């Protein structure tokens with residue numbers, strides 16, 4: 030069995046191996062990459078996402094979110110307070126202001142310590158889930174706006190044509206902006222490209238140990254758990270690496286830098302934070318191996334998680350028994 034310790038693997042494809050996305054994902058899985066829940070892919074040196082980032086300041090962040098924490102330093106929830114619209118240029122200036130900028134630090138490990146010690150005491154502002162792309166239309170390899178759609182994958186594997194579309198989203202971050210512990214909708218893959226700026230630190234639980242995380246989460250967030258059998262789908266709960274180690278939860282950590290891709294695998298719980306001003310692009314995707322995870326994915330039916338239009342069909346076709354209840358939560 031390849032990668033039995035479930036370590037995060039790092040790949041360095043050649044330009045020739047970068048030509049066929051599906052084939053390269055399947056190659057990574059033949060080496061056991063999926064067992065970690067997360068892999069890093071460093072693109073060939075010949076590749077570029079686009080020519081420059083000099084013309085992005087007029088993108089609009091229509092609903093910036095202020096991430097307000099409650100709890101203790103190692104175990105907290107965050108809610109997202111809506112703020113007034115601002116451009117990327119305005120957001121970048123805000124991120125670099127004395128109130129929000131990255132503090133002085135020695136290395137990534139010192140910054141991580143500072144994050145976990147101090148995150149709850151501040152409320153950073155995040156631009157999330159902005160539909161759009163920064164890949165040049167003439168970038169032909171690993172262009173996240175030109176990947177095969179999940180609806181086409183389901184049709185190829187299962188024979189059923191469904192409505193829906195699958196497009197990329199941009200994320201503008203600053204110091205301390207945080208992504209809570211979650212798996213992807215319908216336990217999909219994700220791919221994330223860090224276009225520019227400061228790094229992003231990731232934590233991940235191996236898929237084969239996901240239920241261990243879930244059990245801890247129900248203990249640490251007992252009211253939320255009573256409210257919803259799938260409350261991590263609300264994307265609000267944070268648990269530090271010190272708390273995870275204290276509770277014997279298997280996990281790994283890695284820092285992504287600008288110019289690097291990360292892939293999350295089906296049912297790989299992950300969380301993390303941004304080091305400073307940055308811009309990432311991400312999209313969900315599927316492979317044949319995903320189908321069986323889609324059929325088993327939990328779902329939020331309490332009303333909180335409220336998701337994309339296109340998730341309807343996945344629930345309807347892969348989880349017909351759950352469909353009725355889930356849809357009542359969406360209406």
Ligand SMILES: O=C(O)CNC(=O)C(=O)O
Pocket residue numbers: 200208219220221293299309311312
């Ligand atoms: O960049 C982000 O906001 C964090 N991304 C993810 O959770 C992802 O790609 O799955």
Ligand SMILES: [Mg+2]
Pocket residue numbers: 084085086087088
């Ligand atoms: Mg612009």
Ligand code: NI
Pocket residue numbers: 211212213219293299
């Ligand atoms: Ni994710």
Ligand SMILES: [Zn+2]
Pocket residue numbers: 256257258259260262263329330331332333334
């Ligand atoms: Zn819920």
